[PDB]
Symmetry: D3
Subunit: 231 residues, 6 copies
């Protein structure tokens, strides 16, 4: 009784799941835990059980882009996952303030996908669980890692054309901090299925004009903290 | 140099502002503080300086509905206000779980207004500041008052007709907790102007099928806590 | 058996109602009638029975903005009101032609609200009753007061930002005369509930780059004329 | 220097124009005037100069549907026409009240076209000139012909399918009286170009479940009345 | 048992129909066939039975614009027509490449109408039948007539205003070749009713900055080829 | 000078590219060619040079979903690819007619993504190149493999919820044949960048109520045929 795309079973699903885009990132994360168990690898979806600080939680890759990741997240959320934290990279939308390697823990997101709109009307917020956000922030503080907080623009467009103007500049003026491609989708799906979500991101560019290791530490720390509550 | 609709001046604006819909509610709130100073009353917008736990903060009425309240909130946000907490009433969207007199502290809202859409594209979240939410929650806990947390549906429609179906049932299924008329507007305006916002509401009905005093205590407590940081 | 927000009863509702935004305006209007009876004051909604030229009609304040005023107008329309005329202020959209203190009697309006869209699809016109418009015009003429006629832009945005362009310039080029915030809402609600509506406005600004007394006279005149038909 | 589709020249354009859909209707109208002059016939656009009650005005066919008629109306409005009255047939949207052969003089219309939306944002009303409406009504009264007044639903769909529900039932509940295909387009174009418009229609069906001659008389009467003002 | 607007009967409908906008074009086409039979002329809809290369097919005029032509096309498609090819004129959207008199055979179209949107959601393509396109192309080649291939922008706006920008420039950059007013409507209706459609157009202008006879030959050739299959 | 996500270089890009969703599918395809060269594997994007019938063309995996695949397709289209054919699986939208294992070669698609809408207005068709479609069809015929032809619904939603109705039933009634998740995106991107595209799909389910090998043969055959033209 395996999940259709993750090819893992319901019993293999822990309460806390760390998600990342790249299956290769799962491999670099697992070796930084105390131990791990490889579970499956199907398409872009790679699943490993991570063991860290006496706690147990999966790390799963979701692929690039909202529709791809919705299949991952739906399979998790409908099969016992209670907390999903996305860790990844992003573009800065405030290049004067937030620079290469800076880390942003996000509370909400702009819904520039389609799938969330196929699930619920556009007016509904893409918003993470406060507790997951508080936990992520507290782990950062404990490790003395400075971080930013803010809204991420989640967009299905990576390569713009020159016909329809990009809204990234509008959202920068609206004080959105960063840009990526899956957080909003995660948050809407999460909310609809009673799954607590959050997101922590490392800036690796700007669309306009050691830190990684720390980001990962923060994310694994938050997962261990959250996991403790369900064990 | 008075504000056009609030008829108060920039110097009279404290860092923290409590907002409520009804000017009569301002009067019932002020007398529960240690002392107060009546500042102005113009149209539906009543402003009083509240004194509570050694702290100083305004209580301002915003009127019914999103466009009316946007004029209030814009005048505050553009003239020195740093934290705005809305306190009011709402309908329950989960009548089995959340009942008459229950109190909900909200993290985000559904944007069923127009004014927010005239300010920023629909995909952008209506989301409150986490710190304001954490503060509100902590005051509740300190007073041993149980509370719910969740998304509020902010709608410009109070009296439905029978032509266009209401989305309230959709949003209830999407796990939105409550319904009111101004929170989303507050949150978008707040975000756009770098003003930290939040909302605490008391259930007084359902669109489908002592506690007040406690709500007010929580709200005044959070305002005093937040105010301390800027004095 | 009181109306929920107006706090008046069905029997207190006359066939003709004059509506204005500001409760203070009700007070300045009532004293210009032959006599009056104060009925209620709840939130921003102030109701007074006006007596003028042997006729009987209410003057009710509706607050600022479309959602707020929809609660007022729905309570009136569902409880026996047959004719509602809004009197108020507006911005000029044709500053070369229509200046400070000029009076505009409006036949239709731009629906830049939300509530009307929650009632009926966007394609439907916001249009006043011709008879109410003809009456308003005829009273103006009788008093030898010059007036303009045209479409009003009804917008939920008073304070623009600099992200999303305002449509006010588009509508000025489309030959819309004035701008305000509630007429469209009135007209749609009116049409949906078989209530005859209209609007007369005095210019008090421009968003781009004695007369009051006369406006009020015109409005009270039209109300007396219309009221005569139902008594 | 002929108009591109009407194949008439600017000098041949009178201040008042009667428009109808069918070129054959122009022929049946012209012979009921005192005299006439055939001007042109190109595609569906037939133009004749009508002479009636000592007055001079064109009767022009506009074809079926909004985009077709917009070319007619734009050529008229940009080349000296001041008043355009559409006369035609329609479906009843209130079959209990308004029956086969009843005549409706319309004040406004539902914009279920595209071309008007390519000219101006959806929120803007399709509304006729009050004076043209008053004139049409007064001619009816003079001839003792009973008439209805109301909003027409102007739709680009004549033959519905069974996938997307028709809004005709919604608009019937919204108290729209009749349905046709060009009035809204006329009214928007009219408003944008400072041309006074109106519409008088005879019911010839229902989408749900002697009089002609009188309609035509009313229309020719109104044209003669309006024309007198510019001669 | 006549069709309501075409005024022909079901038995008079051939499997292949050539459609054109102008009823006068039907007259110039019929005389180029081997023989013909005039069937009807009602409003802008002129129907003639064409006889060419031993084959039998109608030529029908559809009028200007999408809503008008939808009535024509629906009456054909619901009454036995299997193949509809539109032949007409268009504007070039690539003036450097495609010039006056050049001929474009179109595979798909931009849906800038309303009626198609009243039939099926905007996301659905306006696309012709490949076989009809292949046939049209092969007839061109047989007659050694050079042709272009591409998407046509079908727009309900002929005369732009200066408020809402035209999308024609956007679609030119998107590599749309030509512009006209009815192809998209034909293609959607065709697809919905299982009718095979296509379009061949001759450039006669640009919105920016012998060949006819050949176009007609190509169109009559394709109709004869297609007709052979059903006889 | 490697492509950012494909991690191949411009010189490694052939004129014809076969694309598939699953990187594992690339592996099963390559071994069926005469020979191959593994080029790269980064994230879900696996690239191999295929050698077949004396011809040279890449096979590249694009991942699940529209936004993910747009990064793949944009990198190809902007770096020398002239023909992209997608081969994959789909759901049947006509379960009576089109069954498990049946193969559909698609001419156009429904744009239920977001990224295409961020590139060009919704009215623009998602349509493949006719020549690629003709080639695919001819290879099928040569191998005596029966196939269907039609429109695919491309949707970003795989797992529906029960709040917002799925349009799949609407599109089935509109005669769309199949459903998948990337074809529309491919086709729009293709059209915008002057890249010829197409799609061949094998039915493996229905959302309502040997053949593989043949599909692959057809796809490799079409790629070899198309490649011959550029070598
Ligand atoms: O989402 C991450 C990301 C996205 C985008 C955006 F969507 F705006 F173009 N920009 C990114 C940037 C950018 F340079 F800011 F543009 C840097 C790092 C990651 C980015 C990447 C997207 C490609 C796949 C990996 N995630
Ligand atoms: O926003 C509060 C409120 C709104 C609405 C809604 F918008 F859904 F109809 N319902 C409320 C309810 C309701 F009964 F749940 F419907 C109770 C108490 C306050 C409500 C009120 C609205 C009227 C003015 C005072 N705030
Ligand atoms: O609706 C009236 C009004 C509105 C607006 C608009 F919505 F465009 F900004 N502009 C007004 C102006 C303006 F100056 F034209 F902008 C003058 C007087 C009244 C105005 C005011 C709005 C604030 C509350 C009282 N009614
Ligand atoms: O606009 C007139 C008309 C339209 C429509 C509608 F658009 F709803 F289907 N219904 C009509 C009806 C109808 F029967 F009510 F449906 C009767 C007479 C004229 C009608 C006709 C439409 C066909 C061309 C002549 N005008
Ligand atoms: O559709 C044909 C057409 C349309 C348009 C457009 F819709 F863009 F304005 N432009 C055309 C042009 C134009 F000059 F390119 F603008 C030339 C020839 C026919 C055109 C004409 C439209 C008027 C009625 C006859 N078909
Ligand atoms: O796009 C293919 C596909 C999609 C969908 C849809 F989007 F409707 F749900 N349904 C599919 C079906 C379905 F069973 F018809 F629902 C079968 C096989 C592939 C399908 C799959 C989607 C998951 C990732 C692989 N492609």
């Amino acid at each position: 009784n395996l999940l259709r795309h993750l090819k893992i079973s319901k019993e293999q699903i822990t309460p806390v799941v760390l998600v990342v885009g790249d299956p290769g990132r799962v491999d670099k994360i697992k070796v930084v835990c105390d131990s791990y168990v490889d579970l499956a690898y199907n398409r872009e979806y790679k699943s490993v059980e991570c063991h860290y600080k006496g706690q147990k939680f999966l790390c799963v890759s979701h692929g690039v882009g909202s529709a791809g990741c919705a299949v991952c997240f739906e399979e998790l959320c409908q099969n016992g996952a209670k907390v999903i934290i996305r860790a990844g990279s992003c573009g800065s939308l405030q290049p004067d303030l937030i620079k290469r390697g800076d880390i942003c823990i996000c509370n909400a997101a702009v819904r520039e996908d389609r799938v969330s709109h196929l699930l619920i009307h556009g007016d509904f917020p893409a918003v993470g669980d406060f507790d997951v956000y508080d936990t992520l922030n507290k782990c950062a503080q404990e490790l003395n890692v400075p971080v930013f907080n803010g809204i991420s623009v989640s967009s299905d467009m990576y390569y713009p054309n020159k016909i329809i103007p990009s809204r990234l500049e509008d959202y920068s003026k609206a004080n959105a901090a960063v840009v990526e491609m899956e957080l909003a989708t995660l948050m809407v799906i999460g909310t609809l299925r009673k799954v607590k979500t959050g997101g922590i991101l490392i800036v690796d560019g700007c669309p306009f004009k050691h830190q990684l290791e720390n980001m990962i530490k923060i994310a694994l720390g938050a997962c261990a903290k959250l996991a403790t509550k369900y064990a």
